[PDB]
């Protein structure tokens, strides 16, 4: 029933299946049930599908362990639409961060490849439905993020935007991703409003395999 979003991100209703290291082809249905429990734009969905058309090697590792990566930001909050058997949760591969009793310092962190394989990384950008969350959590109406590399880089400075109820959510987090090669580095800088990596996807390329929608 899962989406690619529900598969890659760590939806608890989706079996993660780290044991599945590589495979022949991808199987979906046309109308996948489980998109993102907290909705949000997922840019370049097409491109990521085509990049994940094939597998030569693929696996999951812990780029930044939840332990010891973020002492100075409280880490453990989740949301209730993202749930497991009627009990709240959040995507396995990622993290929220918020202050230490309303104590947001701002961040600069980075990582480069030692594994010598190619790497796939995800993150997110927070769009609250109201401002009291913004001031309360992060204590800046200002937003400014800068996710940086050699090839790719981009910044983000969003505001509140009152969207309608979708899965009992007006809020949004827009998801943003990239590939990263051996030798190259990523930096994250931010004044909050982030979804950070817990786990990242190590891989080699593949060739020629691909994707199916099917109910057979």
């Amino acid at each position: 029933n899962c989406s690619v979003a529900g598969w890659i991100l760590g939806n608890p209703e989706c079996e993660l299946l780290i044991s599945r290291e590589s495979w022949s082809y991808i199987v979906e249905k046309p109308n996948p049930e489980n998109g993102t429990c907290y909705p949000g734009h997922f840019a370049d969905y097409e491109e990521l599908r085509e990049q994940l058309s094939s597998v030569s090697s693929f696996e999951r590792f812990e780029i930044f362990p939840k332990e010891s990566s973020w002492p100075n930001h409280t880490t453990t909050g989740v949301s209730a639409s993202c749930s497991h058997n009627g009990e709240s949760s959040f995507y396995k591969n990622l993290l929220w961060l918020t202050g230490k009793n309303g104590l947001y310092p701002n961040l600069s962190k980075s990582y480069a490849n030692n594994k010598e394989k190619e790497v796939l990384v995800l993150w997110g950008v927070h769009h609250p439905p109201n401002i009291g969350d913004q001031r309360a959590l992060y204590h800046t109406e200002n937003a400014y993020v800068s996710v940086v590399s050699s090839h790719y880089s981009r910044k983000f400075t969003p505001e509140i935007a009152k969207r309608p109820k979708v899965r009992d959510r007006e809020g949004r987090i827009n998801y943003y991703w990239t590939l990263l090669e051996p030798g190259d580095t990523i930096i994250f800088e931010a004044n909050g409003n982030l979804i950070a990596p817990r786990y990242a996807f190590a891989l080699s390329r593949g060739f020629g395999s691909g994707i199916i929608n099917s109910n057979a």
Partner: single-chain antibody, 236 residues
Framework: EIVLTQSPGTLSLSPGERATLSCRAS???????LTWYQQKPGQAPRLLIY???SRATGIPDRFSGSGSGTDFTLTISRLEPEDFAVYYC??????????FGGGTNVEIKGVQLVESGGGLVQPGGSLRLSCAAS????????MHWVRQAPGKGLEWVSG???????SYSGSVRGRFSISRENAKNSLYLQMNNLRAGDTAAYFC?????????????????????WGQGTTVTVSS
């Protein structure tokens, strides 16, 4: 989580007077971390103040506090005989453990929850409680069960986040056991191996907006709202 120290556990003062109360801990503990309550004996608690400065809903503007680090403080601008009450000091540990100051009487000189099952058992025995929800989404908030002996400092029995990470005290753990139901909009507390330390009043308590949901709900790191509690006792 850290031991607190209220100052004073009771005081006696006259009308048209301020009142300084100081709740201070072992360590320095960062100050959007406490919340402050009142209670009349016979009534359940009520919320007043949070994070050592700031003020709740449905309010005058008289109780106002300050302080930081190790020493937190709530002051009072004016005293009145309607305020005749015990005020409390409740802090959210980073070890996710609420800790409690032992209540502070002011003497003046001249939507809802519902509990279920409170009563008597034999000591060394077994009994369960439930709570049930009314007029909100029991999905969201981070829940706590609490105890209170009569006219004593409170004790925090237990609480649980919606992601399943538990927190008990090391003495109470194993003897009590919780379970939650959001689809039912209700809560459960099966309990075994019960002794006279459990002879006390209890409360079910709705806490904290986890990260994310639709509403006109802010959050604090304070309570959301209490229940009316109920008595539990062992005897023979």
């Amino acid at each position: 989580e850290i031991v607190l120290t209220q100052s004073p556990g009771t005081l006696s003062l006259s009308p048209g007077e301020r009142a300084t109360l100081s709740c201070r801990a072992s360590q320095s503990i960062s100050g959007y971390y406490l919340t402050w309550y009142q209670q009349k004996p016979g009534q359940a608690p009520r919320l007043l103040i949070y994070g050592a400065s700031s003020r709740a809903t449905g309010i005058p503007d008289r109780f106002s506090g300050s302080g930081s680090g190790t020493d937190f403080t709530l002051t009072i601008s004016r005293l009145e005989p309607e305020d005749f009450a015990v005020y409390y000091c409740q802090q959210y540990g980073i070890s996710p453990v609420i800790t409690f100051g032992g209540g502070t009487n002011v003497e003046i000189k001249g939507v809802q929850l519902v509990e279920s099952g409170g009563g008597l058992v034999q000591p060394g025995g077994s009994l369960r409680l439930s709570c049930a929800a009314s007029g909100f989404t029991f999905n969201i908030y981070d829940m706590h069960w609490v105890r209170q002996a009569p006219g004593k400092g409170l004790e925090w029995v237990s609480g649980l986040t919606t992601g399943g990470d538990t927190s008990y005290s090391g003495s109470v753990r194993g003897r009590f056991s919780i379970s939650r139901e959001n689809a039912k909009n209700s809560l459960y507390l099966q309990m075994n191996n019960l002794r006279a330390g459990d002879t006390a009043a209890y409360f079910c308590v709705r806490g904290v907006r986890e990260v994310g949901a639709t509403g006109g709900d802010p959050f604090y790191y304070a309570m959301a709202v209490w229940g009316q509690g109920t008595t539990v006792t062992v005897s023979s």
